[PDB]
């Protein structure tokens, strides 16, 4: 089980997550749900996520990322999940 830091927790809650403690599988699930709630993926190139000007981009340190190269996402999670 992991406990997200507050900015990441707010993202998960905005996507429908409840509580403070999660499995990594649950964190990944609600990050995907957040990207869809905020409509951050490109409808015409659906592996591309454009997160500039969103809190998610601020945590990632990126304007965009691809689901085919999730390395910046994993770097963020390592920094923002307390295990």
């Amino acid at each position: 089980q992991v406990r997200p830091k507050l900015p990441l927790l707010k993202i998960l809650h905005a996507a429908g997550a409840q509580g403070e403690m999660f499995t990594v599988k649950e964190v990944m699930h609600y990050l995907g749900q957040y990207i869809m709630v905020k409509q951050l993926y490109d409808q015409q190139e659906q592996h591309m996520v454009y997160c500039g000007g969103d809190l998610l981009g601020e945590l990632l340190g990126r304007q965009s990322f691809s689901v085919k190269d999730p390395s910046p996402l994993y770097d963020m999670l390592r920094k923002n999940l307390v295990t």
């Binding site: 990944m28 995907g32 990207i35 869809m36 993926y41 659906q46 592996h47 689901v67 085919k68 999730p70």
Partner: peptide, 8 residues
């Protein structure tokens, strides 16, 4: 999107 995301 979800087809790709759930494949991680």
């Amino acid at each position: 999107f979800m087809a790709f995301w759930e494949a991680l």
